[PDB]
């Protein structure tokens, strides 16, 4: 009856990079989900196959935490069957997703005043991701001649988050909620 | 933003509704699904997406609707099956482009009438009303929706109020009013004009003190 | 689901007004509200997105405000084009919940029923039916009551209402009621009253027949 | 000949109300007054006649009243179709005096114009003229003042519509080796002369 | 019962017009014929009254030597003659109806367009500007009257301000349509003058 | 001074069918005083201004609708039987509403006109003919009285209330 470590997953002070997003893998632990879904802080809380309200009352196997940071204008690629170049370079959920997307917007703890950088993306790739693939490489990207390691772009960019900011330009911090022998989360 | 025309089943009735976007990409757009019901009321059928794309439902209808694309036609359709009881109402499809948006361009094209299980195609039975007075038109006893009802062949147009139909015992009732002088009538001929397409009916009725 | 209260459900507002519609959801949904406006006669459009952000092809006229649960859509020097209905959607969490809907309306003057008699026809007795009409034409609000009453005794049944839509040109309402009953029972009675109670008159003076 | 000095020239008003235009002969002219209805771009109608006498139609709202050389027509309860303009005539005398004319508006709370500047199009120079548009749409009441500057300079034809019964209100337009640009708008709206 | 009249004329300045309103409904034996001048300038004036079942004639002193009042019972009809016709003397006509002495004019004509000032085809422009946009179309140097002016096929009708018009007209029309409708979506005008028939698309200036 | 008071304010006026002429002559005539009363109704003249004029008087009773009748060329009872204007007449008709002074209580039927004749009167002629009208009738009530009287109430409408009227002729 110990309690899920939800608390070091959502207000995580530092949050990665959505070419690099983190996974936390939930176990052994009874979960009250009404404290996030009635939280009020939240823009975007989208589930698939369960209800928000009809999620306490369900067991699982294990419950995997997702967590990254984009740009306003691309929350919108946070689902199943989505395109761009979060969905389709960093970041793909597949179609029979049965979990949750929440995200939030975090204008007050990831931009400063001279641009904070410390958040990437991948901007090029020769194929489209995989479902819950991560892609770590740091080649250089070849739009005929080899590139020898120095046409030829680095294939991560980082983010040029300013407070001034407009809203869809904006940091946003999003968690994805993947749920799955005996189960060992319960509500 | 094209939609089928309006159309008038019976219940037991499976009916079929599209939607044509046009004047951007159909293909990377949430397409929604909405209802309007005569209660000031406005549900959420559901939504889907295209290219790739599941669907998701209101639970209200998981079991009601059914939510289809084609990307090659560049169209939308959504299936109701079975008769949605009497509970009849206008039907639309919207354009969503995902989170932290909303949705920007609507079709009314389609609306979706339900008839009364046992119907039958009647013509109107249309009664003169008599006592700036007053006159009326009665058109009673008709169905289906709807009965044209002009005076003097669009004539008499001001102060006309020609009254919404209402469905009671599975047929249609109207009423029609026109404020004409007191001087221009009975001097000048007043003659209510009823036309029912789903009969081919055209009548006249000269109102007479 | 999220609840959706927008408040009010409608006003009359005048020409060259600015107003405000509020809408208010049962959980803070941090700007994600979108707003729709439906004219009489033609299709919805969407106006504004993601709380205060407005689209293209919409009038400067139009702004969104409000944050947590709390949201208002305001327009300022009204024109002729915004006599309309307004929602305000959530997009937050599914199922996308929708508001009642507030409707705005030209802010007229009152007015008086032309409220008339019309005894049955004979072409509806032939037939076989019976049924009396009063027409209530050109009145404002639309706040209303009608009765019937056969020689004095309210009869709730038997009693068949239209309402008409909308002020248009005219700028006003219009109502017709119609008392039909059946032959055997229409031929035993005289007096037949059509009492109509309205804001204006304290008392509702009827419109009767015999 | 008869003077008739009738009053208002004009008055803005709201539906639903009740007016009086007044008119005043130079002498008694014993109930021997009618009164007349144009509507916008119609014909005319004959409303009153010797005095307090209804003509054919004219609802219960039109009334007359009035003795020796002052009159009055009645309207109550405003209806939708008379915003139109009204006429005393005299037929006590030759000549036939007739009056000077009283107008109907609705009573709007002002307006702002969309005031828009249209430099000279291709086809205008081709043929040699040149010519300058500046709009100014929806606005309320007509009286507003337009001004021209060529490059500073305060230097013309206009024209104006009536009121758009839809929204109730008025509209105006102002417009080669000369050409080879400012429309400077003073309105009630605005102390400060907004220009394009 | 709402009687008839004659048609516009376009005279020129010196000349003599006949202008024509033709009695049904009612009893013209028993009616007394008016007219009335409406201009720009001094509107409503009188000029006069005639008897039909004489022909005599009251007309006022004003003017007076360029009307006469003819009538014809037989066609059931009322001439009015202007003979001066002055170049500025240019104003609507109307016949009322006159029924006698404590009385009024009840019954009026639709009134005829009569211009005396002293074919030319139109010259149509674009106006195109340098969220809700307006265009214009200018239509210079054309004569005589009317002009029609539609956008589209009739389809864009809301928003839509066309203004009145060296003996010749300036015509101005202008239409607000929003950001997105213009320039993404062509917008025609179309003029058409009683034999030359245009359409201007319209093109920015850039 | 001309004796246009003698005619204008005379208590007692005659019926139209006996209407009464009085000559105006040798005398000056300021007629301001006239178009200056504002106690008349009806002042049309024919074929000369008042405003620069500066006689016979013909005067009678009739009904408020009939005064449209005392114009030249005109039809109807009054101007067919009882008085008739000629065409180029150049003269003014003047009337004025006595209600207060011709009419009482129960009707004053001293004032009568001329119902049926058998043709027109020609202009400025005078008919007090009183034979019974053939529609033979030896001299006793299809067959009728020639002349009728009016009932001058004063709660009558102004249509039916007496009007006098007094006709310039030079």
């Known amino acids: 009856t110990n309690l899920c470590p939800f608390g070091e997953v959502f207000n995580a002070t530092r949050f990665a990079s959505v070419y690099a997003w983190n996974r936390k893998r939930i176990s052994n632990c009874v979960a009250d989900y009404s404290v996030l879904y009635n939280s009020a802080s939240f823009s975007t809380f989208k589930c698939y196959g369960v209800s928000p309200t009809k999620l306490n009352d369900l067991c699982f196997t294990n419950v995997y935490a997702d967590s990254f940071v984009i740009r306003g204008d691309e929350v919108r690629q946070i689902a199943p069957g989505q395109t761009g170049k979060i969905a389709d370079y960093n970041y793909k959920l597949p179609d029979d997703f049965t979990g949750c997307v929440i995200a939030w917007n975090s204008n007050n703890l990831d931009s400063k005043v001279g641009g904070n950088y410390n958040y990437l993306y991948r901007l090029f790739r020769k194929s489209n991701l995989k479902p819950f693939e991560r892609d770590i490489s740091t080649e250089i990207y070849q739009a005929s001649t080899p590139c020898n390691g120095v046409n030829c772009y680095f294939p991560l960019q980082s983010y040029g988050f300013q407070p001034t900011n407009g809203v869809g330009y904006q940091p946003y911090r999003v968690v994805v909620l993947s749920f799955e022998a005996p189960a060992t989360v319960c509500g | 933003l094209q939609q089928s025309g309006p159309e008038l089943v019976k219940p037991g009735a499976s009916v079929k509704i599209s939607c044509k976007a046009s004047g951007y990409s159909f293909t990377d757009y949430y397409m929604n699904w909405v209802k309007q019901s005569p209660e000031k009321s406005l549900e959420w059928?559901?939504?889907?997406?295209?290219?790739?794309?599941?669907?998701?439902?209101?639970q209200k209808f998981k079991a009601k609707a059914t939510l289809t694309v084609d990307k090659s036609s560049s169209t939308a359709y959504m299936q109701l099956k079975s008769l949605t009881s009497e509970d009849s109402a206008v039907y639309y499809c919207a354009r969503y482009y995902g989170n932290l948006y909303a949705m920007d361009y609507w079709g009314q094209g389609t609306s979706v009438t339900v008839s009364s299980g046992a119907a039958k195609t009647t013509p109107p039975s249309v009664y003169p009303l008599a006592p700036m007075v007053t006159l009326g038109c009665l058109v009673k006893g008709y169905f289906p929706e709807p009965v044209t009802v002009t005076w003097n062949s669009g004539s008499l147009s001001s102060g006309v109020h020609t009254f919404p139909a209402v469905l009671q015992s599975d047929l249609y009732t109207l009423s029609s009013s026109v404020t004409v002088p007191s001087s221009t009538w009975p001097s000048e001929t007043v003659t209510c004009n009823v036309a029912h397409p789903a009969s081919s009916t055209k009548v006249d009725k000269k109102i007479v003190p | 689901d999220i609840l959706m209260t927008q408040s009010p459900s409608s006003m009359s507002v005048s020409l060259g007004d600015t107003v405000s519609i509020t809408c208010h959801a049962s959980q803070g949904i941090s700007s994600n509200i979108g707003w729709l406006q439906q004219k009489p006669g033609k299709s919805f459009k969407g106006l504004i997105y993601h709380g205060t952000n407005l689209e293209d092809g919409v009038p400067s006229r139009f702004s969104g405000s409000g944050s947590g649960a709390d949201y208002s859509l305001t327009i300022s020097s009204l024109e002729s084009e915004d006599f309309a209905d307004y929602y305000c959607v959530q997009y937050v969490q599914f199922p996308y919940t929708l508001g009642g809907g507030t409707k705005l309306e030209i802010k007229r003057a009152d007015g008086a029923p032309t409220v008339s008699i019309f005894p049955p026809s004979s072409e509806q007795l032939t037939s076989g039916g019976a049924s009396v009409v009063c027409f209530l034409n050109n009145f404002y609000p639309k706040d209303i009551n009608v009765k019937w009453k056969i020689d004095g005794s309210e009869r709730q049944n038997g009693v068949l209402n239209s309402w008409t839509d909308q002020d248009s040109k005219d700028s006003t309402y219009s109502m017709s009621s119609t008392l039909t009953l059946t032959k055997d029972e229409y031929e035993r009675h005289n007096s037949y009253t059509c009492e109509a109670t309205h804001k204006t008159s304290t008392s509702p003076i009827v419109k009767s027949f015999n | 000949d008869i003077l008739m000095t009738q009053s208002p020239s004009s008055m803005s008003v709201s539906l639903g109300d009740t007016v009086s235009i007044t008119c005043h002969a130079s002498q008694g002219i014993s109930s021997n007054i009618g009164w007349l209805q144009q509507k916008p771009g119609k014909s005319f109608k004959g409303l009153i006649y010797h005095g307090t006498n209804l003509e054919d139609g004219v609802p219960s709202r039109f009334s007359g009243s009035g003795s020796g050389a002052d009159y009055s027509l009645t309207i109550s309860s405003l209806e939708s179709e008379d915003f139109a303009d009204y006429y005393c005539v005299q037929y006590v005398q030759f000549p036939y005096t007739l009056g000077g004319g009283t107008k109907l508006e609705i009573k709007r709370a002002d307006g702002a114009p969309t005031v828009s500047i249209f430099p000279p199009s291709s086809e205008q120079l081709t043929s040699g003229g040149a010519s300058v548009v500046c709009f100014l749409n929806n606005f309320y009441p007509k009286d507003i003042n337009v001004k021209w500057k060529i490059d500073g300079s305060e230097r013309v034809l206009n024209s104006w519509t009536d009121q758009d019964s839809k929204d109730s209100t008025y509209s105006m337009s102002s417009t080669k080796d000369e050409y080879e640009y400012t429309c400077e708008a003073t309105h009630k709206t605005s102390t400060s002369p907004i220009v394009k | 019962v709402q009687l008839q009249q004659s048609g516009p004329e376009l005279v020129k300045p010196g000349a003599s017009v006949k202008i024509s309103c033709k009695a049904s409904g009612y009893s013209f034996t028993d009616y007394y014929m008016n007219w009335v001048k409406q201009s720009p300038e001094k509107s409503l004036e009188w000029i006069g009254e005639?008897?039909?079942?004489?022909?005599?004639?009251t007309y006022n002193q004003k003017f007076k030597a360029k009307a006469t009042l003819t009538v014809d019972k037989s066609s059931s009809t009322a001439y009015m003659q202007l003979k001066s016709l002055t170049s500025e003397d240019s104003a609507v006509y109307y016949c009322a109806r006159y029924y006698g002495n404590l009385y009024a004019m009840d019954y009026w004509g639709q009134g005829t367009s009569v211009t005396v000032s002293s074919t030319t085809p139109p010259s149509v422009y674009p106006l195109a500007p340098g969220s809700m946009v307006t265009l214009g179309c200018l239509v210079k140097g054309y004569f005589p009257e009317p002009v029609t002016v539609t956008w589209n096929s009739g389809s864009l009708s809301s928003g839509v301000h066309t203004f009145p018009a060296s003996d010749l007209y300036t015509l101005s029309s202008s239409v607000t349509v929003p950001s997105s409708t213009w320039p993404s979506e062509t917008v025609t005008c179309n003029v058409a003058h009683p034999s030359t028939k245009v359409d201007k698309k319209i093109v920015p200036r850039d | 001074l001309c004796p246009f008071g003698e005619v204008f304010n005379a208590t007692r006026f005659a019926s139209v069918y006996a209407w009464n002429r009085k000559r105006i002559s040798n005398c000056v005539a300021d007629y301001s005083v006239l178009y200056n009363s504002a106690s008349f109704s009806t002042f049309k003249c024919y074929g000369v201004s008042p405003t620069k004029l500066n006689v016979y008087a013909d005067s009678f009773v009739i009904r408020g609708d009939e005064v449209r009748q005392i114009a030249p060329g005109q039809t109807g009872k009054i101007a067919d039987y009882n008085y008739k204007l000629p065409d180029d007449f150049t003269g003014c008709v003047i009337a004025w509403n006595s209600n207060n002074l011709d009419s009482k209580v129960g009707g004053n039927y001293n004032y009568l006109y001329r119902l049926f004749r058998k043709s027109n009167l020609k202009p400025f002629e005078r008919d007090i003919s009183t034979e019974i009208y053939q529609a033979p009738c030896n001299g006793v009530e299809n067959c009728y009285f020639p002349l009728q009287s009016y009932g001058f109430q004063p709660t009558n409408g102004v249509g039916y209330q007496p009007y006098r009227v007094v006709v310039l002729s030079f």
């Open positions: 005639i008897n039909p079942n004489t022909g005599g004639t």
